[PDB]
């Protein structure tokens, strides 16, 4: 969740440019963002975000059952940019934009330029439109007119790892050791895949409900080999765009 990013990382964007959500959400999927070519100083404009996935496909949920996907994103605007205040949004636009206040949360108090949204139901939000208010360089020394980059990180679907560091049910599970599979037990969970190693020992690998077992009893497996498929339906993607902070007249 975006919340998890906030606890883990003060800065959501790595030097490489990789967005932190990637640490948890392993798979890559597209992210799209559209903004105007240029905007006048203290003006409000819309940033349109889309996170595509096939609505027909269901994801493994916490209980192990299938369900819909939720989406969320981090939108990093240039310094001085912030989500627009309701008062600032012009009349035609207000209906067009996401509920300006409610959907959007700042990354941190200092971080108002970095906007977080979600999780939201994927079916509901095909497009997430952020009302954005540009800064005014005349008033603000910190910012100047020029071309700036906006970075988007957008995710759909449950992540692979927890801030605990432990893997979620929406991930591949691998054989802890090489050997033959004596047996497997099941409440959705394979409480255990029992593997008989090369020299008499027997080990048990527990997999949570959700992933689907690739292997069958009596099958030999190498260490680290995949016990299950990769159930992950979703993914996280990033895209950059540029906007010109223009001078009036």
């Amino acid at each position: 969740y975006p919340f998890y990013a906030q606890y883990n990382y003060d800065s959501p964007r790595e030097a490489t440019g990789k967005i932190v959500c990637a640490n948890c959400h392993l798979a890559k999927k597209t992210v799209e963002i559209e903004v105007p070519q240029a905007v006048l100083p203290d003006t409000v404009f819309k940033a349109v975000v889309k996170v595509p996935y096939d609505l027909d496909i269901q994801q493994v949920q916490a209980d192990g059952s299938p369900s819909g996907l939720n989406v969320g994103a981090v939108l990093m605007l240039p310094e001085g940019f912030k989500l627009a205040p309701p008062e600032r949004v012009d009349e035609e636009l207000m209906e067009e934009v996401g509920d300006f206040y409610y959907l959007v949360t700042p990354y941190s108090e200092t971080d108002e330029n970095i906007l977080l949204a979600g999780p939201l139901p994927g079916e509901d939000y095909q497009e997430m439109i952020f009302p954005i208010l540009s800064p005014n360089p005349a008033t603000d020394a910190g910012v100047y007119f020029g071309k700036y980059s906006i970075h988007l990180g957008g995710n759909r679907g449950r992540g692979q790892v927890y801030p605990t560091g432990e893997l979620s049910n929406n991930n591949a599970f691998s054989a802890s050791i090489a050997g033959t599979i004596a047996a497997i037990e099941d409440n959705g969970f394979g409480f255990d895949v029992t593997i008989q190693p090369e020299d008499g020992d027997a080990v048990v690998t527990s997999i949570l409900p959700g992933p689907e077992l690739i292997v069958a009893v009596g099958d030999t497996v190498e260490a680290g080999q995949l016990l299950t498929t990769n159930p992950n339906v979703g993914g996280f993607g990033q895209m950059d765009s540029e906007i010109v902070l223009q001078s009036s007249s």
Binding site: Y1, F3, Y4, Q6, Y7, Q61, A62, D63, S65, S67, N70, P119, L120, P121, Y162, P163, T164, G165, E166
Partner: protein, 97 residues
């Protein structure tokens, strides 16, 4: 008496509040979403009497307001946790004395 379970603290901290809850056989335990959602009810396990591993609702209520309420009776201490906010440290308890 009728109680409620809030999911999340004003400190943008995803945790079950009150961390601890006590009630009597026949009381009810509501559940509302504070913030840092979504959330859901994913009990841990309860002693003979109730069915912790049943009430668990994976219906992640995105819409913030007030998930739902449920009445209990089986005496003992019930434990649960947040499926998502599992590592964030969002666990609580419920007693039915």
């Amino acid at each position: 008496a009728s109680v409620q379970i809030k999911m999340g603290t004003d400190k943008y901290a995803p945790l079950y509040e009150p961390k601890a809850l006590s009630i009597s056989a026949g009381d009810t335990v509501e559940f509302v979403m504070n913030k840092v959602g979504p959330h859901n009810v994913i009990f841990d396990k309860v002693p003979a009497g109730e069915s912790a591993p049943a009430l668990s609702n994976t219906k992640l209520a995105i819409a913030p307001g007030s998930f739902y309420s449920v009445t209990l009776g089986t005496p003992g201490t019930y434990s649960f946790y947040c499926t998502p906010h599992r590592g964030a440290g969002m666990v609580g308890t419920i007693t039915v004395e």
